[PDB]
Amino acid sequence: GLTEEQRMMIRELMDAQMKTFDTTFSHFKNFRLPGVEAAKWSQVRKDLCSLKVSLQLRGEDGSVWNYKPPADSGGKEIFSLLPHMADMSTYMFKGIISFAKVISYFRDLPIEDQISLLKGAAFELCQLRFNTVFNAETGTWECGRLSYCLEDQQLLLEPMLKFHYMLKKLQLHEEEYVLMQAISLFSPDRPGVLQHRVVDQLQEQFAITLKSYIECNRPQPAHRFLFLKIMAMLTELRSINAQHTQRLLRIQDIHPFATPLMQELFGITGS
Amino acid sequence: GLTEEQRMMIRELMDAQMKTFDTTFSHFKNFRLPGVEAAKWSQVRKDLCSLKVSLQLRGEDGSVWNYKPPADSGGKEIFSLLPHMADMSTYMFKGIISFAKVISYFRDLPIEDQISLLKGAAFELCQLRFNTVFNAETGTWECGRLSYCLEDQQLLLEPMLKFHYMLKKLQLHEEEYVLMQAISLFSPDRPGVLQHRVVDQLQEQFAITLKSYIECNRPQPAHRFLFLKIMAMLTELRSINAQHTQRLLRIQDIHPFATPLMQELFGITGS
Ligand SMILES: C#C[C@]1(O)CC[C@H]2[C@@H]3CCc4cc(O)ccc4[C@H]3CC[C@@]21C
Ligand SMILES: C#C[C@]1(O)CC[C@H]2[C@@H]3CCc4cc(O)ccc4[C@H]3CC[C@@]21C
């Protein structure tokens, strides 16, 4: 019940996803690993401990490294995983940038709006991709040879975590995830966007395509209001983006760690 | 019931031990860690898998790294822990060399015999020190922030492992361990020793001191024949030294890894 244009639209997104989502994280390499104003530090300390993960590395040889993070003891140890997570997020951002560049509707926007949209949405698309490797049973993001496992439902109070669990429970198709990415990417109201009307019309077409996809392929009572649920999650994701952007900038202010690509995307000038 | 000379002898050994045994391994640093002719390889493969350990690193910040070694899959991965163990053994050898140098009876030997005795006994003294940090309940050598845990009584078939368990069960005093070190160190029949008679008389005095120590301080039926048990263990330790020296040289032959200090001690010339 999709139009030809809607079918072509999904095919281009799925193509873009297939070409640019390293789902096994096989090419994530050379990353850093953890070693072997007072009001600011207090807030930053709060920000950081709200998402504790251990990390597992399975070697190509069958060996396994496992890292359990330190407790907060009033020192710099709370930052131990930041270089690694900066490297992972950087790797993901590159995939997201490549994704957007492969899409015709994106390529056709002026370069200034392309940059503005990626700056506005990179984090969100990263999270959408991360959700597809999230294991809600084990509380683990399974990134190929790397695993990030949540450390021991006071966990669901954390908006990012609540987001991943709730989104996972929707049991979305690849197509629905990639349409969510498109809808997030083509948000007409990111800071600095000039072609507000063009971007708005594109977003609307992605949303219509998604709504139609769900109607054509999901007759089950469980999936009533699925389209509206997804849109609500996208709104929540935008809120989480704003929150984590401020968390990032707060850390950066007292403890610099953003990679150049991160700085570029989050507006850090280097001065 | 010890003579004054025997008491002075134990005091000098205990002093030497106290000065040169880093029991917390606090100064073991900058070590390597595992990454993130056919008949020879077959034997070497057998040699290596006969002692599997996982490794734990507790960080000063409370973080914990844990390494589980790979299975043998016909490749170079069986060597993954060798650089680390070379670094640890090297660190231990330095302590053993320092131990010997602090002892009057050793200092008074000609420099050529000093070298010959250290070459002959360094491995044995290393093992004697390692036994004092061996936890027989957990099958773990507890080396301060580093732990080496035996991987899951087919284990007791391995002579080195049988040695550590049996020696631990004797529940020796610090004094008895350090006398064992002396007896091993002053073995008159290591290759190249010139002052055979002098070294022999020294060893005999350490053994007499040990026997007297046990008689003076251990009246319990459990400790009957303790001196003879210890001497039997020293003989076994010498056998294990010969075995592991040949294992080391077999590995080295197809996969070089010995540090310069190891090469020096085990007779590798660099050519
Ligand atoms: C603070 C804080 C946190 O809640 C814990 C870790 C922080 C993330 C660290 C890495 C990272 C990378 C990005 O590209 C963007 C954001 C972040 C931080 C966001 C706030 C986090 C999750
Ligand atoms: C082979 C073999 C083994 O049984 C497994 C690991 C080998 C040790 C590796 C490091 C090391 C260092 C030394 O100074 C002396 C010997 C060794 C090797 C001995 C044989 C071992 C235990």
Author numbering:
A (entry chain A), B (entry chain A): 142 to 177, 195 to 310, 316 to 434
Give excerpts from the publication.
To explore the outcome of combined exposure to chemicals and establish a detailed mechanistic understanding of this emerging paradigm for EDC action, we focused our attention on the xenoreceptor PXR (pregnane X receptor; NR1I2) which has been identified by the US Environmental Protection Agency ToxCast's program as a major front-line target of chemicals. This NR is a key regulator of the body's defense against foreign substances. To gain structure-based insight into the binding mode of EE2 and TNC to PXR, we solved the crystal structures of PXR-LBD in complex with EE2, TNC, or both at 2.00 Å, 2.55 Å, and 2.25 Å resolution, respectively.
EE2 binds closely adjacent to H12 with a binding mode that is reminiscent of that seen for 17β-estradiol, both in presence or absence of TNC. The position of R410 is further stabilized by a network of hydrogen bonds involving S208 (helix H2') and E321 from the loop preceding H7. The remaining contacts between EE2 and the protein involve van der Waals interactions with several hydrophobic residues. Our study shows that individually, EE2 and TNC are too small to make all the necessary interactions ensuring high binding affinity and effective stabilization of the active conformation of the receptor.
